[PDB]
Symmetry: C3
Subunit: 183 residues, 3 copies
């Protein structure tokens, strides 16, 4: 119990997808559950701005969300794309990605710093599914400051046709993952 | 501990795949584990009737299983395709899908009510794998009555060739998922 | 708490990929977490020997790792490809695959003894992703002795082109799974 760090169910716009957009244009739902040596995660994204919700009118698209954490395990909102700190339900460090399992400053050892999977986008018209490649990069590149941990999410759409012809709420079906915690 | 709602390991025929089949023609193994703000799930299906175990002689097939729950979190067996209530191992409401994260009566917000993935069918002859698209829909459509929650599973086979030439035990490899609980 | 059986984060070479190789040529990271009636798992592999790290110069490849356990839930290292016993973090039987859900000596019932999924290999040059079919077989074939449980991992590369032209650290992106425990 009380072993859950998250963005809260239906959070307000809390991240920035478009660079240079003083306003949050996306809604990221991230749920991290401590479960022994593993963190059980859940991640889905919803777009809010007209710009975000138009990215799927093109056959190709990329969305990246970077989370940087300090030694205590607190989200460094100024440097991260997620602008609202995570909470608990009703020791953030225990929800963080092991710097041992996932080491920093290493390209010789950067490969074991990635989780790769597939999630989907359901079109607004015929409700068809477009697969989205999703990658989660743990630690590895500490942007700067006193970044003690990092979690970067990236969704990539690479289709032969555009999933939408016009504005439609961008949504990424839920991607499940786990990673070894710093305990 | 005691935070697990399931159908029991090797249950008897407990669901109805073919509409209008007074008898249960399938064996659904569903395991739901409470783990903080997330339910960790496991689902696999085994076919029992000659009819079910012949669905894979065609290149296309669809199987749907709807679970409807009341406010307490109890399976409404008369309305659901699963006909035997779930049990525990030796607060069902805490195993239910958040009506906040996954709202009812909403097509404007029905997309974030789906989990989509792939699981597999292993042929009885050359043991080859056929991918099965699987979708889990949370709440969204409350069939009727005092349905407080809903979980619908759907497997879809869409192949160029038929996986089987004759009767063979239909089996769906295990699909893992998670969803935000009503806590 | 203390409900986690694993190989330890960055273990030393601990398994044998190439048959007849008195020395361990691979690093397997396996994390098993007890979570109610389900074990939550995480598995990734890193190759150490020049031979292992050359397997991806061919368009096709197969890697198999067999774990055999005794009644207590202890790894039988002499018969298994994993040569170092698992530990805990700071009742192995409770981390074992149910012999009920996953029965032995049964091909009539061998299909429900498999978990199938996809994980990836990131090439060393252009960092592209090659999908790897992964299969986990639970119990089913008890090699011999007093094998009370079995977990076999198998990764298969089947590409049109070879992912690498020369030696490169073989790595399999993390595959997540769950199975019903013997409780």
């Amino acid at each position: 119990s009380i072993n859950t760090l998250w963005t809260g169910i239906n959070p307000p716009p809390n991240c920035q997808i478009v660079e240079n957009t003083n306003t949050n244009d996306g809604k990221l739902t991230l749920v991290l559950v401590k479960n022994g040596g593993l963190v059980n995660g859940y991640v889905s994204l919803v777009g809010v701005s007209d710009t975000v919700n138009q990215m799927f009118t093109q056959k190709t698209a990329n969305i990246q969300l970077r989370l940087y954490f300090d030694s205590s395990g607190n989200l460094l909102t100024e440097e991260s794309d997620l602008k609202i700190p995570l909470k608990n339900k009703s020791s953030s460090k225990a929800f963080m990605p092991s710097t041992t399992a996932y080491p920093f400053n290493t390209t010789t050892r950067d490969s074991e710093n990635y989780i790769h999977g597939i999630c989907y986008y359901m079109t607004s018209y015929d409700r068809s599914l477009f697969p989205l490649n999703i990658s989660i990069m743990l630690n590895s590149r500490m942007i700067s400051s006193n970044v003690a941990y990092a979690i970067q999410f990236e969704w990539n759409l690479n289709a032969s046709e555009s999933p939408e012809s016009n504005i439609a709420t961008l949504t990424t079906s839920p991607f499940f993952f786990s990673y070894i915690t710093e305990d």
